[PDB]
Design an enzyme around this catalytic site. Structure first.
Site, PDB file in Angstrom:
ATOM      1  N   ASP A 210       2.036   3.305   7.635  1.00  0.00           N
ATOM      2  CA  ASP A 210       0.982   2.460   7.426  1.00  0.00           C
ATOM      3  C   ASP A 210       1.080   0.897   6.743  1.00  0.00           C
ATOM      4  OD1 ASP A 210      -2.168   3.138   7.318  1.00  0.00           O
ATOM      5  OD2 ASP A 210      -1.040   5.255   7.642  1.00  0.00           O
TER       6      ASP A 210
ATOM      7  N   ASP B  59       0.857  -1.344  -0.029  1.00  0.00           N
ATOM      8  CA  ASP B  59       0.112   0.038   0.031  1.00  0.00           C
ATOM      9  C   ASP B  59       0.835   1.248   0.023  1.00  0.00           C
ATOM     10  OD1 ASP B  59      -2.401   1.637   0.020  1.00  0.00           O
ATOM     11  OD2 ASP B  59      -2.301   1.540   2.224  1.00  0.00           O
TER      12      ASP B  59
ATOM     13  N   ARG C 216      -0.012   9.298   0.396  1.00  0.00           N
ATOM     14  CA  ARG C 216      -0.733   9.400   1.748  1.00  0.00           C
ATOM     15  C   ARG C 216      -0.108   8.645   2.827  1.00  0.00           C
ATOM     16  NH1 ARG C 216      -3.489   6.282  -1.679  1.00  0.00           N
ATOM     17  NH2 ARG C 216      -3.672   4.116  -1.294  1.00  0.00           N
ATOM     18  N   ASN C 217       0.642   7.573   2.314  1.00  0.00           N
ATOM     19  CA  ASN C 217       1.124   6.645   3.332  1.00  0.00           C
ATOM     20  C   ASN C 217       2.702   7.075   3.483  1.00  0.00           C
ATOM     21  OD1 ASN C 217      -1.188   5.079   3.794  1.00  0.00           O
ATOM     22  ND2 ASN C 217      -0.760   3.852   1.891  1.00  0.00           N
TER      23      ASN C 217
HETATM   24  C1  LIG Z   1      -5.790   4.375   5.599  1.00  0.00           C
HETATM   25  N1  LIG Z   1      -4.412   4.550   5.442  1.00  0.00           N
HETATM   26  C2  LIG Z   1      -3.981   3.407   4.416  1.00  0.00           C
HETATM   27  C3  LIG Z   1      -4.340   5.853   4.682  1.00  0.00           C
HETATM   28  C4  LIG Z   1      -3.835   6.906   5.935  1.00  0.00           C
HETATM   29  C5  LIG Z   1      -3.862   8.318   5.499  1.00  0.00           C
HETATM   30  C6  LIG Z   1      -4.010   9.072   6.849  1.00  0.00           C
HETATM   31  O1  LIG Z   1      -4.941   9.615   7.206  1.00  0.00           O
HETATM   32  N2  LIG Z   1      -3.111   9.092   7.548  1.00  0.00           N
HETATM   33  C7  LIG Z   1      -2.871   9.784   8.792  1.00  0.00           C
HETATM   34  C8  LIG Z   1      -4.178   9.995   9.599  1.00  0.00           C
HETATM   35  C9  LIG Z   1      -4.138  10.325  10.880  1.00  0.00           C
HETATM   36  C10 LIG Z   1      -2.980  10.946  11.542  1.00  0.00           C
HETATM   37  C11 LIG Z   1      -1.715  10.715  10.707  1.00  0.00           C
HETATM   38  C12 LIG Z   1      -0.523  11.034  11.368  1.00  0.00           C
HETATM   39  C13 LIG Z   1      -0.284  12.003  11.569  1.00  0.00           C
HETATM   40  C14 LIG Z   1      -0.477  13.461  11.083  1.00  0.00           C
HETATM   41  C15 LIG Z   1      -0.002  14.426  11.942  1.00  0.00           C
HETATM   42  C16 LIG Z   1      -0.548  15.692  11.827  1.00  0.00           C
HETATM   43  C17 LIG Z   1      -1.539  15.949  10.660  1.00  0.00           C
HETATM   44  C18 LIG Z   1      -1.977  15.039  10.146  1.00  0.00           C
HETATM   45  C19 LIG Z   1      -1.682  13.665  10.344  1.00  0.00           C
HETATM   46  O2  LIG Z   1       0.919  12.161  12.214  1.00  0.00           O
HETATM   47  C20 LIG Z   1       1.368  10.746  12.189  1.00  0.00           C
HETATM   48  N3  LIG Z   1       2.389  10.309  12.856  1.00  0.00           N
HETATM   49  C21 LIG Z   1       2.714   8.845  12.757  1.00  0.00           C
HETATM   50  N4  LIG Z   1       1.588   7.977  12.350  1.00  0.00           N
HETATM   51  C22 LIG Z   1       0.559   8.654  11.770  1.00  0.00           C
HETATM   52  N5  LIG Z   1      -0.382   7.806  11.315  1.00  0.00           N
HETATM   53  C23 LIG Z   1      -0.301   6.296  11.320  1.00  0.00           C
HETATM   54  C24 LIG Z   1      -1.319   5.736  10.527  1.00  0.00           C
HETATM   55  O3  LIG Z   1      -1.742   6.618   9.318  1.00  0.00           O
HETATM   56  C25 LIG Z   1      -0.014   5.810  12.592  1.00  0.00           C
HETATM   57  C26 LIG Z   1       0.269   4.363  12.633  1.00  0.00           C
HETATM   58  C27 LIG Z   1       0.420   3.761  13.666  1.00  0.00           C
HETATM   59  C28 LIG Z   1       0.297   4.483  14.870  1.00  0.00           C
HETATM   60  C29 LIG Z   1       0.154   5.751  15.070  1.00  0.00           C
HETATM   61  C30 LIG Z   1      -0.109   6.432  13.668  1.00  0.00           C
HETATM   62  C31 LIG Z   1       0.304  10.266  11.888  1.00  0.00           C
HETATM   63  C32 LIG Z   1      -1.660   9.936   9.563  1.00  0.00           C
END
Ligand SMILES: CN(C)CCCC(=O)Nc1cccc(-c2c(-c3ccccc3)oc3ncnc(N[C@H](CO)c4ccccc4)c23)c1
Ligand SMILES: CN(C)CCCC(=O)Nc1cccc(-c2c(-c3ccccc3)oc3ncnc(N[C@H](CO)c4ccccc4)c23)c1
Lengths: 300, 300
Positions: free
Chosen positions: B157, B139, B143-144
């Site tokens: 992701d 994937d 976005r990832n």
């Molecule tokens: C469904 N997926 C295949 C698509 C993911 C796209 C998405 O919406 N990513 C996302 C969503 C929400 C938060 C984050 C994220 C952020 C973040 C920070 C500021 C503004 C917007 C987003 O920062 C992050 N740092 C680490 N991980 C993040 N997200 C992943 C999951 O997307 C994650 C995985 C495991 C633990 C914590 C976070 C993140 C990233």
């Protein structure tokens, strides 16, 4: 008898320039952002356009035109021309970043000591130019200094400015309605205005900058200011100011006007300080302190 | 028989960390911004916290934990730990600038070719790490890929990621529900996934970046994509891309997966291009052109 003023007053057609947007309005009238395109040449000059048909006000606009048309210096705004429409319009170079007062207020967190001190130098240079031209501004404040770029500011708003004769050292005003919190004590008491009364106002202008746009004597109504100043009370030492800098401010605010520094001296002294800015202004920038990034915290 | 996975799964108490704000929500659950403060040490680690109590979903979160806990590279996000609350929570380093897709979309006007090409190198390095770990992402998209700083991005992701045996070269999926517009044709037709199917998706990810966040095959519904690709049709050459760069994209999209480049080759080739970025990406930045500033237009 005295030096002929051979400045050129350029008359512009309304068709030459294009109003784009209102930048501001008030008792002064309104000011527009615009583009000026002289028919002959392939240039497009960004300009600010100012208009108010009262009789006394029309005389005053033209008095302001006379002064702006008669100045030429990198740290003072010159008149580009006037347009004789139903009401008279003043035209000048656009200063896109607006007045310095507003600029310092909404950039506190990104204004460094180098910029503060350089501005102080630039304003002092513009004022020294005006002094050489025998011109007493009478309304120097942070609001009347415009920002062309963050590193280049210019003095403006000559609506109270007065020319002086070779055989004359002061100007005795009448009627008044002048900003009280920026003017020297001898001006409050006796309506006298000098190059050294402008230096007082320069002091207050510097105080505005160092306080990032604070209102001088915030809690005080205009009628008290005279007596407060008579008592020996002055604007407080701003947090970021070393005694070195605050000493210059205080010198600008002495009773004996001749004791106050000259703009040429102020240029020098602030110039010296601009060579090592963090020695003279203490600013934090120039939430927690135990915060650590995850990929510097490794498995225990 | 095969290399023991001696990764450590750290279990964290809910009292150790503080939810500050929701960063986003959806079918994945929700993700919070937070601070993690281990009791013993004087550190405060900024973290992102992810939670969805369905049975199948709980298995999937833990599968994602396994993978994130088993990776360690500057260009891939690692799992810091999990918290066993009513629902299970994944904890990882906060990537404050969010996903790269959103970043390029709302900074078009200030993203230079140096950054675009460096990102391409960094993603290729992360993917090559994953390939070395015998891990097929399945994937990869803009976005990832998350942004720690504008100059440092990381792959994330792993919810579809799969480990491979030493004696195994591909993964045969089942059920599916995978993003169609980023996946290789052999994956669409035969549900086969390889390191070289990730390279296809890398191609599409690079295409996203160079188009500043455009949607691939914008006008096309998912069901057609197979046949379009079967016909020999591909994503168009982005405006800013030289043939040199677009040739790399196209190579990632060939029918014969072994003909596609390896991530280590992609690292090298984009690395070379990063040494002279403006030779390989043509960007305007890196209103009228007859505009002149008033104090360069002097009296005629
Ligand atoms: C469904 N997926 C295949 C698509 C993911 C796209 C998405 O919406 N990513 C996302 C969503 C929400 C938060 C984050 C994220 C952020 C973040 C920070 C500021 C503004 C917007 C987003 O920062 C992050 N740092 C680490 N991980 C993040 N997200 C992943 C999951 O997307 C994650 C995985 C495991 C633990 C914590 C976070 C993140 C990233
Ligand atoms: C009443 N005065 C003693 C206080 C003046 C404070 C003020 O409101 N100044 C002001 C008001 C409106 C426009 C401008 C101005 C701006 C500007 C640009 C962007 C955003 C905000 C303001 O740019 C300017 N460039 C040149 N002159 C300006 N104004 C003066 C009169 O203040 C002026 C004088 C003569 C002709 C044209 C403009 C300006 C400056």
């Amino acid at each position: 008898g005295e030096a002929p003023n051979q400045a050129l007053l350029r008359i512009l057609k309304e068709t030459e320039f294009k109003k784009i947007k209102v930048l501001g309005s008030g008792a002064f009238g309104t000011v527009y952002k615009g583009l000026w395109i002289p028919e002959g040449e392939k240039v497009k000059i960004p300009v600010a356009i100012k208009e108010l048909t009262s009789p006394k006000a029309n005389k005053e606009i033209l008095d302001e035109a006379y002064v702006m048309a008669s100045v030429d210096n990198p740290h003072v705004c010159r008149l580009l021309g006037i347009c004789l429409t139903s009401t008279v319009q003043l035209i000048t170079q656009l200063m896109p970043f607006g007045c310095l007062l507003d600029y310092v207020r909404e950039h506190k967190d990104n204004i460094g000591s180098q910029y503060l001190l350089n501005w102080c130098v630039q304003i002092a240079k513009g004022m020294n130019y005006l002094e050489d031209r025998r011109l007493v501004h009478r309304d120097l404040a942070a609001r009347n200094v415009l920002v062309k770029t963050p590193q280049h500011v210019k003095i403006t708003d000559f609506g109270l400015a007065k020319l002086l004769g070779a055989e004359e050292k002061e100007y005795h005003a009448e009627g008044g309605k002048v900003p009280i919190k920026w003017m020297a004590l001898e001006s409050i008491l006796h309506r006298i205005y000098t190059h050294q009364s402008d230096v007082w106002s320069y002091g207050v202008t510097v105080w505005e900058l160092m306080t990032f746009g604070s209102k001088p004597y915030d809690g005080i109504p205009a009628s008290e200011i005279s007596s407060i100043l008579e008592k020996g009370e002055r604007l407080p030492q701003p947090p970021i100011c070393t005694i070195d800098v605050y000493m210059i401010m205080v010198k600008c605010w002495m009773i004996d006007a001749d004791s106050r520094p000259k703009f040429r001296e102020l240029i020098i002294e602030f110039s010296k300080m601009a060579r090592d800015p963090q020695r003279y202004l203490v600013i934090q920038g120039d939430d927690m302190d135990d915060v650590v990034d995850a990929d510097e915290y490794l498995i225990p």
